[PDB]
Write a protein that binds this ligand. Structure first.
Ligand SMILES: O=C(NO)c1ccc(-c2csc3c(=O)cc(N4CCOCC4)oc23)cc1
Length: 120
C-alpha cells in the first residue's frame, strides 16, 4: 500500500553506454589528428602554461571524463556532456580565436555534437 518502488528507470545505462562509445569513437584513430592534445590533462609545467591555472578554474581532459564513467560518477549524459563541453570551453576560454588548438577543438566538438545529439 505504501511501497512505490518508483524511479526514472535504468535506460541511463543505455545513455552512459552510448555516452561511452562516443568517447570511444572520440578516441578513434581517424580523429587522432585533432584529438591527441585532449587525451590527457594539460601539463601546465611542461607546456609552460603559466596562467592556465589562474583562468581555467575547472580544467578537463578526455582521460578524466573517461574515469568518471568507469566510476559511474556521472548521473546522466547531461553531466557527461558537461565535462566534455567543459573540456572545449577551456580551449576557447584560454586561447585566442585564430589559434590552431581551437581549430582542433572545434573539429573534435563537431564529431561530439553529432553523435551526442543523435541519442534517442
Ligand atoms: O605538445 C604537446 N605534446 O607533446 C601538447 C600540446 C598541447 C596540448 C593541449 C591540450 S589542450 C590545451 C590547451 O588548452 C591549450 C594549450 N596551448 C595554448 C597555446 O597554444 C599552444 C598550446 O595546450 C593544450 C597537449 C599536448
Amino acid at each position: 500500500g505504501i511501497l512505490p518502488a518508483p524511479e526514472k528507470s535504468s535506460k541511463v545505462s543505455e545513455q552512459l553506454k552510448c555516452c561511452s562509445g562516443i568517447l570511444k569513437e572520440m578516441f578513434a584513430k581517424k580523429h587522432a589528428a585533432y584529438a591527441w592534445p585532449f587525451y590527457k590533462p594539460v601539463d601546465v609545467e611542461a607546456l609552460g602554461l603559466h596562467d592556465y591555472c589562474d583562468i581555467i578554474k575547472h580544467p578537463m581532459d578526455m582521460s578524466t571524463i573517461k574515469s568518471k564513467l568507469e566510476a559511474r560518477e556521472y548521473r546522466d549524459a547531461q553531466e557527461f556532456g558537461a565535462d566534455v563541453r567543459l573540456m572545449f570551453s577551456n580551449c576557447y576560454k584560454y586561447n585566442p580565436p585564430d589559434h590552431e588548438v581551437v581549430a582542433m577543438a572545434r573539429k573534435l566538438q563537431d564529431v561530439f555534437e553529432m553523435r551526442f545529439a543523435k541519442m534517442p
